[PDB]
Amino acid sequence: GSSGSSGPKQRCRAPACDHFGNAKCNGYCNECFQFKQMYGSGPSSG
Ligand SMILES: [Zn+2]
């Protein structure tokens, strides 16, 4: 945020992600979208 820089609002909806996102991925980028998933969603569980 240097002296208020210009730029389109077509970037990942994350504070630590300067990559191009996409509506499908809820705005976020594939990377973020995937990660978001609950780590450990295997088919089996006890
Ligand atoms: Zn992202």
UniProtKB/Swiss-Prot annotation:
Transmembrane segments: none annotated. A zinc finger (A20-type) spans 8-40. Changing residue 32 to A: Impairs polyubiquitin binding, abolishes inhibition of IKK activation. Zn(2+) 7 binds at residues 12, 17, 29, 32. This is A20p37. It comes from Homo sapiens (Human).
